[PDB]
């Protein structure tokens, strides 16, 4: 009925998962400490069985753009005010929910972070930062966050991007789109499968958006190597594109026409997913691009606030980029 797969916890199931995360928050010092990173995938085997069944099956389905879990309770009074910056965003009220996200993520794969993004944290924060309303990063607000493959520039980008909505009082929509296969002619499709496109790293990997891996980002922005936008099966391709940071190879007008066509087709097929408070989404970063609608920030303590995590099916595929730590890349 919809392009994502959806699961709704019963009150009993939701309370059991919450109790499990609360227990972890009492026994472990931090969510992305080495001890909990190793233990979380096994603790997650204790989550409610109906949820584990959904995650195991839905990950193997061929069609969904995202796996959506609704119905986690969040008490605004216990959670407290939305932080003013991500640096101070590991508040006690949000702590059990950060553990909950880690437990759900462990059913899907291996979590990791980036040395060049929010100080190498694995669980990151999405919130509006005053003065950054018209930027191209996820702390924007008044300017729409254009659609993108997460970390498109990198061969080590996530297979799944997890988002947990801590609060979203004005119902701001996440945007999604898949490959517009019904409108791509064969010739245009052929071009998108060839290595004729440049993809640069987005602004969230810049030094200015953080408090030696930055040299790799500079090389990627300065001298990008040509890559394909589409890979895999022609009838169900995987997608790698960033609307704001993608370009054709220099002088390649055939590739430019193909990228220009794809831009218009994705713009025309973008749809909206609203993550209400307590909703979790795992976006398939190979099948879909995602973004976020423009909204007016409040800055009154009740702004939209998400926790975010990157998930790969195999951490060993990124060995070359382990930044002195398997769980932080760069
Ligand atoms: N604005 C564009 N095209 N992409 C940047 C947004 C990304 O999701 C980035 N990892 C961020 O959080 O800002
Ligand atoms: Fe994103």
Main sheet? 8 strands, mixed
Cofactors and ligands present? (2S,3S)-3-hydroxyarginine, fe (iii) ion
Order of helices and strands: EHHHEHHEEEEEHEHEEEHEEEEE
Rg over C-alpha atoms, rounded to the nearest angstrom:
19 Å
* Cα-to-Cα separation, first versus last residue: 40 Å
Count of the separate structural domains: 1
Gross morphology:
globular
Helix proportion range = 25-40%
Count of separate DSSP helical elements: 8
What proportion strand? 15-25%
Based on secondary structure, the structural category is: alpha+beta
Instruction: Work out the number of β strands.
Output: 16
Write a compact overview of the structure shown.
GO terms for molecular function: 2-oxoglutarate, L-arginine oxygenase (succinate-forming) activity; 2-oxoglutarate-dependent dioxygenase activity; iron ion binding. By secondary structure, the chain is an alpha+beta fold.
Would you mind describing this structure in some detail?
With 330 residues, the protein is an alpha+beta fold. It has one domain (1-330). Helices cover 26% and strands 21% of the residues. The chain has 8 helices and 16 strands. It has helices at residues 11-27, 34-43, 49-58, 76-79, 95-106, 186-192, 214-222, 253-269; strands spanning 5-8, 66-70, 110-114, 124-126, 145-148, 160-167, 173-178, 197-199, 230-231, 238-239, 246-248, 271-274, 280-284, 288-292, 305-312, 328-329. The strands form 4 sheets. Strands 1, 2, 3, 4, 6, 13, 15 and 16 form an 8-stranded mixed β-sheet that branches. The protein has a 4-stranded antiparallel β-sheet with strand order 5-14-7-12, with helices on one face. A two-stranded antiparallel ribbon has the order 8-11. Strand 9 (230-231) and strand 10 form a beta hairpin. Helix 1 packs across helix 5, helix 2 packs across helix 5 (95-106) and helix 6 crosses helix 8 (253-269). The longest helix is centred in the first third of the chain and has 17 residues, at 11-27. The radius of gyration is 19 Å and the shape is globular. The N and C termini lie far apart (40 Å). (2S,3S)-3-hydroxyarginine (ZZU) binds at residues 136-138, 145-146, 148, 150, 202, 204, 242-245. (2S,3S)-3-hydroxyarginine is lined by residues 136-138, 145-146, 148, 150, 202, 204, 242-245. The chain crosses the membrane at residues 97-115. Pathway: Antibiotic biosynthesis. Its cofactor is Fe cation.
């Amino acid at each position: 009925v919809r392009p994502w797969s959806e699961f709704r916890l019963t009150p009993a199931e939701a309370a059991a998962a919450a109790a499990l995360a609360a227990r972890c928050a009492q026994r472990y010092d931090e969510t992305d400490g080495p001890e909990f990173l190793l233990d979380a995938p096994v603790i997650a085997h204790e989550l409610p069985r109906r949820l584990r069944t959904f995650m195991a099956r839905a990950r193997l389905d061929a069609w969904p753009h995202a796996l959506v879990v609704r119905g986690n309770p969040v008490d605004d009074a216990a959670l407290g005010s939305t932080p003013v910056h991500w640096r101070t965003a590991r508040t006690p009220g949000s702590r059990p929910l950060s553990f909950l996200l880690m437990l759900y993520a462990g059913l899907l794969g291996d979590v990791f972070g980036w040395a060049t993004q929010q100080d190498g944290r694995v669980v990151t924060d999405v919130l509006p930062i005053k003065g950054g309303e018209h930027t191209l990063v996820s702390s924007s607000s008044r300017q729409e966050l254009g659609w993108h493959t997460e970390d498109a520039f990198s061969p080590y980008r996530a297979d799944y991007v997890g988002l947990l909505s801590l609060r979203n009082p004005d119902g701001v929509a996440t945007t999604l789109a898949g490959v517009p296969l019904d409108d791509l002619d064969e010739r245009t499709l052929d071009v998108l499968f060839q290595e004729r496109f440049l993809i640069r790293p987005d602004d969230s990997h810049l030094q200015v958006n953080n408090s030696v891996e930055f040299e790799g980002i500079a090389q990627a922005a300065d001298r990008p190597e040509p890559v394909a936008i589409l890979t895999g099966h022609r009838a169900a391709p995987h997608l790698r594109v960033d609307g704001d940071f993608s370009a054709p190879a220099e002088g390649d007008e055939e590739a430019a026409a193909a990228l220009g066509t794809l831009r218009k087709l994705i713009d025309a097929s973008l749809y909206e997913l609203v993550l209400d408070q307590g909703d979790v989404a795992f976006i398939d970063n190979r099948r879909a691009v995602h973004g976020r609608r423009a909204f007016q920030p409040r800055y009154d303590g009740r702004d939209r606030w998400l926790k975010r995590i990157n998930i790969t099916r195999d951490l060993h595929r990124s060995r070359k980029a382990w930044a002195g730590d398997s769980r932080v890349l760069g």
